[PDB]
Symmetry: D2
Subunit: 295 residues, 4 copies
């Protein structure tokens, strides 16, 4: 037997950082959960009990806090790139670092219509994420994403004209509820290293905001022919607005809400045009994915 692939590191490292503006008294907080996995010439720790090649996972944890102390933690694309680069530059035998960051929402509170200087609310479970792969000699690959964005529209979704055969019971519909939890990822063109990532810093927050905006607007405005058709429209627009993105991927559950026939009870009408009360279904759910790139 031989080691074909190996990676190790620290997961679930929770980190908070505060910035205090001394002039204005305004404080801004950031909270993230970080995972760093390393690869390199470490096979002997597996095969020979040779711990000399192991940067202890406890040390990786320390490094994350130290790096957060000495560097900006926003945008997460930049922080992840700094963190990953550190390991390949510091340790000769480490040749790749994989950094995953989940950013948690702390939204400044408005109190009596004014932004509060130091109070925050978790206004959603939506996350902004990054995956950064720093590979020696091969640059920096960054995938940015939003996830946990949960939406519903109560009309202007249709689903008809699908394949019908002896396995099919689903009725065609011209008016249904559509609800999903959005997971969208945009993959950046490869960057040559930290200098290039730094040069593009303003684009990261802007592109996240654009991806969010396009997702929400398209969802709300599309008279949807299917999840497939609507998600394609989203991806197309994002690629159009940011030339440094190579691909956009969406992964969308179709969270079903079923009509409830109540006609057995005193002829009560609650289906089709008369449908008012529905049963949200916890499972099963459709799952629809697509990756869209450039011609």
């Amino acid at each position: 037997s031989a080691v074909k692939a190996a990676r190790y590191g620290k997961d679930n490292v929770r980190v908070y950082k505060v910035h205090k503006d001394e002039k204005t008294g305004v404080q801004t907080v950031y909270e993230m959960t970080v995972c760093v996995l390393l690869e390199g010439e470490i096979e002997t720790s597996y095969t020979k009990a040779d711990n000399s090649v192991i940067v202890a996972t406890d040390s990786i944890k320390n490094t994350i806090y130290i790096t957060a102390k000495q560097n900006p933690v926003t945008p997460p694309e930049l922080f992840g790139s700094i963190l990953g680069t550190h390991f390949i530059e510091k340790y000769n035998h480490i040749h790749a670092a994989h950094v995953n960051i989940v950013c948690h929402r702390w939204t400044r509170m408005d109190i009596d219509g004014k932004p509060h200087p130091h109070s925050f609310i978790r206004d959603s479970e939506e996350k902004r994420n990054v995956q950064v792969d720093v590979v020696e000699g091969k640059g920096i690959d960054i995938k940015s994403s939003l996830s946990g964005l949960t939406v519903l529209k109560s009309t202007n979704s249709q689903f008809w004209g699908f394949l019908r055969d002896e396995y099919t019971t689903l009725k065609e519909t011209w008016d249904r509820i559509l609800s999903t939890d959005v997971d969208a990822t945009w993959q950046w063109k490869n960057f040559s290293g930290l200098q290039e990532v730094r040069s593009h810093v303003p684009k990261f927050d802007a592109t996240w905001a654009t991806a969010r905006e396009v997702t929400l607007k398209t969802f709300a405005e599309d008279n949807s022919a299917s999840v497939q058709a609507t998600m394609y429209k989203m991806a197309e627009q994002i690629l159009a607005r940011q030339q440094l993105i190579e691909t956009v991927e969406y992964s969308l559950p179709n969270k079903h809400y079923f009509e409830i026939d109540l006609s057995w009870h005193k002829g009560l009408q609650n289906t089709g045009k008369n449908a008012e009360v529905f049963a949200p279904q916890s499972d099963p759910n459709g799952l629809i994915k697509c990756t869209v790139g450039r011609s």
Copy 2:
């Protein structure tokens, strides 16, 4: 042996309802999870296998959907009261109904600065809840609550002057992070029945909004001496603003964020006035409760 207490019913009944304004085209959605438990002269189903006294839990589920079809589902205090009253009026041998409702957020989307007619976002995991106990001959007892409201302030929290003995290692502090998930309940004066609940309908949404507002403002503005002191200020204000509330209860975790001493690393300063990077602690957590009533 004898049956001392017994209750049974249906839990986790998910319900969605849509209202469609035909004039304006605006749609409004409500989604809830409902539990109904009944009590009454049902001992024989336990002791004698006498199912004749059992309103099947499946029938309770049907009843919830039928009631939602025929009645407004908002405010939840009203819907729960209608639902509970139904069971004690319909079944001679059922003498109490306990209705718990969790309302899920579907907040109307703003698209290009205008409210969308039929698109919604789950903008938080915060819930609005009710517990309604309808007891034959004893009226309707309603407890309203908000839960899952997660907040953090990065300064203007202190904790000093506590008991110090041989079990104590905690240092006094004049500047710390304070973060919690708010669970607040207000208990209404007993209502004589549905007519009285109906007479107070406008107060329910108003009081929920006030409780939320007071909670957030007090949290943000109090230079907090402790969780205990700050929560008392909240409860006091709520009781002052709504005379039909008898008691207010808060249950608050203290979600700790610890300083990280980095001085071992190149004399790096990250404690006290120099603290920037903190380690959020998943557990353990302080838990502080109080129930405040009228003099």
Copy 3:
């Protein structure tokens, strides 16, 4: 306004303890999650920002570890009683301690048919719990429980003869699946204090084992007329076998498995006597409770 009730302390305190037999080399591990809440003359911490009455929750955490170091942690009824007693004896102004303990399973591994001296498996998510209320002048009240015991029987459950009216669609059945997650609590007679709890130490593990055994055997062997009828049989037996128990409470979800009619597909028969494939339902679920005491 006035403080009507107040309690505070530390939740989610994870604790592990190892016992090492030096003669045999056998090691035994215990892992628990502990919550301790205190009550007493502490109103002024809420109303006057008087922290002098507060035993810091951090100190409560320290106390739990210290107590675990100096005392046996099994049975949990004993440990909880020691822990609760500590607070009321140590602090003059603390008059009640509430201790909740969840014991996690670490079952010794059998390797090649022999018990391993120091290796363990979490063989189930089932818990053994205690709630101990130590109230000055009023003794020690202990409720013991098991929870998270998940079972299913594929036949020998019936449900017929229930009330049928215009809300009823459920068909009577003489053969169904029955599945539940068992939550069972037995409440001990009040104990005068620690000496009395110590005097009964052997009964605690024995009664837990008996409660588990009776639950499983009754479930497996009863040709069940309903959840209500079967659970009553369990409670009756437990009360019969341990005279120091005053009440037994069961809380049982009915986790439904629905038949799937496949007759639309090539006349496939999958209902009634021909039912083989079923759809487990995540929600809603029946919820059935009962508390059984002595005549």
Copy 4:
């Protein structure tokens, strides 16, 4: 823009099946959660709103139940292969099916030392899983796994001799607790189609049992130099015992249990040789992975 990759289908399909032996009266239950995703010539559903190419996800759900009715559901490697093959044979334009199955434990109860004919216990949250990729013209690729197997050993784990630099605070140790949740995957050699999978049916359960056995025994008996070294020993043995496996992958969290220094309290000794009470850490955790193949 162009569609680079697309797949869609149904997730979270819960399925139960019962087998009833009419001779012996013994019943055996199987419960699984199934996901099926399809790929093929479906781009136009995304780009042109052409639903004619879509096998509705609701139909996929129906197909799963129908297939479970007409075929054995065990071993899951066989069922997944039947299910995947169905879609590529039935639909000309579908060229790949991806089937993921999670098997849930229903272990027969022993009552009074004898196996019960129809009563079952969920004796662990451990799962047995399969991922089956059926690709037209390319055969059937099967990855089998166990997950959620949670173990702890209280001694006979060491960790010393790792890299020490200015980021390192971790002390070397010759005696620590080791605990993990095992996720292990074995990948089968490619099979040419269903006939070949059928020919190997007995190997599937046998190899799962062997993988479990080797994992547990190695964990219990290895005087572990590190997670890396111990996991390599497991993978090596599995590859040795089943020649039709090409690779074995382990992914293991290191679930840390920290010593608690109690010396501040009356000189209490609870570290090193005197360590009895530990603090299990919920996060962060080490994460160690490796994939082992043949020379």
